[PDB]
Design a protein around this ligand. Structure first.
Ligand SMILES: N[C@@H](Cn1c2c(c(=O)[nH]c1=O)CCC2)C(=O)O
Ligand SMILES: N[C@@H](Cn1c2c(c(=O)[nH]c1=O)CCC2)C(=O)O
Lengths: 259, 259
């Protein structure tokens, strides 16, 4: 009945503007894993949709003072969008305010190092300072450390807040560039699937090391109580059971791997 | 207000009767990952509960003719139980009739072989018949092959239905015993976490080989629309974010590993 407003965020390889986007229009201007996923969900559910980019460039958190939700979660909470399709982590605080489909992708926080860096685990990082390490300055990865009550991760958080120069980065691109240019003196903590994607990108100078720090999942989000939630969740399960989600990851991660 | 009726199934290491169960009573007669998980969920949600064992020993499927749901899913569908806490796979057909929490455990179908068996992948199995291979005769693993439209898995299903003697087993214990006694001539297809658990059990003669065939998750189930669903889902997310689910797996899988 009404075109579905999808909120998403520019982040390779999930959503990217095509090289020739200036000659294109509407949803066709974009490409990537989430662009393909959105089309698949829309096809299965039978709805038309419009891809829009989240205004504040955030995933979703609530300001402790104003109690206002930002990011894509906020767009859903305040009715600015009907669905969020992005690498959005399912978390308890977000679950309380919006609906989430079952996971369409599994991941965990992981360590990205420049090849040759003498680090094999989070415990290794926590015990030293010569090799700096940090996370994005917004998002679930940062929140994991900030809220952790596990000794090793809490120590890492205390290290991150007090380390100089700042170990935080504004974007994935910045984090990756920092690892690449720091001669092994910076390790980036990020979600495993992003680590995996970057490991297959030229100059092929990074790698994922150690096991993941946690086990989470990305889910499609809708406003709490939205009648679209049920259908979208069944669509995700259908796509997974058909093997289409695995094919989608292979397409954007490995089929054209550069290493 | 009312004691919550939990339905579960005997399956190591999820639910097992304690060695001294005859001297015990109620929930204390049982031990295992799901017994611990049920206690944790009940603690977080603030409810009292009773562990009961599913009468028909099945997880949950709908008879094509009678349209009746069996297993733990059926107990929920027909109101015989309030919640199912077991290694129950989240699937589309089940999702349509009952509510599921987000996954508390991730897994995928995998291959279990006797050490020394010349098999490294499902494709390897599909191309031959000397080494027989099968699944449980009920459940999601069998259903994966029966419903698959992927060439390799459909070929494997056609092989399973026509292979002699029957390659199907009634229980995990039977499947494991068959692998152990078949001198490398039987490979068992089962959920990865069970494969991992068995690999750390004496006689230490089995091993998990190749990558998983799919990526799924186990979820806590409740009757559709149950007011208990929300709280239970938040409890699962809370336990995961606290690191308790990882600790629980380590406790029942590796802390006392025998290999
Ligand atoms: N998934 C997180 C957002 N996020 C993302 C990446 C990461 O490494 N860390 C992180 O917090 C890469 C893609 C998105 C959220 O939902 O806040
Ligand atoms: N999880 C499946 C049940 N199930 C289980 C195991 C397996 O290897 N295969 C399988 O189908 C081991 C534990 C339970 C379902 O929900 O039907």
């Amino acid at each position: 009945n009404k075109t579905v407003v999808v909120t998403t965020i520019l982040e390779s390889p999930y959503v990217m503007m095509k090289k020739n986007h200036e000659m294109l229009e509407g949803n066709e201007r974009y490409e990537g894993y989430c662009v393909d996923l959105a089309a698949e969900i829309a096809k299965h559910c039978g709805f038309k949709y419009k891809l829009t980019i989240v205004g504040d460039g955030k995933y979703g958190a609530r300001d402790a003072d104003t109690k206002i939700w930002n990011g894509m979660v906020g767009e859903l909470v305040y009715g600015k969008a009907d669905i969020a399709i992005a690498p959005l982590t399912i978390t308890l605080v977000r679950e309380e305010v919006i609906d989430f489909s079952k996971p369409f992708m599994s991941l965990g926080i992981s360590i990205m190092i420049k090849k040759g860096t003498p680090i094999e685990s989070a415990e290794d990082l926590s015990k030293q300072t010569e090799i700096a390490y940090g996370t994005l300055d917004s998002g679930s990865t940062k929140e994991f450390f900030r809220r952790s009550k596990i000794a090793v991760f809490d120590k890492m958080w205390t290290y991150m807040r007090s380390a100089e120069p700042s170990v935080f980065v504004r974007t994935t691109a910045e984090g990756v560039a920092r690892v690449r240019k720091s001669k092994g003196k910076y390790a980036y903590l990020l979600e495993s699937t992003m680590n995996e994607y970057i490991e297959q990108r030229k100059p092929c100078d990074t790698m994922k090391v150690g096991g993941n720090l946690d086990s989470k999942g990305y889910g499609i989000a809708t406003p709490k109580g939205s009648s679209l939630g049920n259908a979208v969740n069944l669509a995700v399960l259908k796509l997974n059971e058909q093997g289409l989600l695995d094919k989608l990851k292979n397409k954007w991660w490995y089929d054209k791997g550069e290493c």
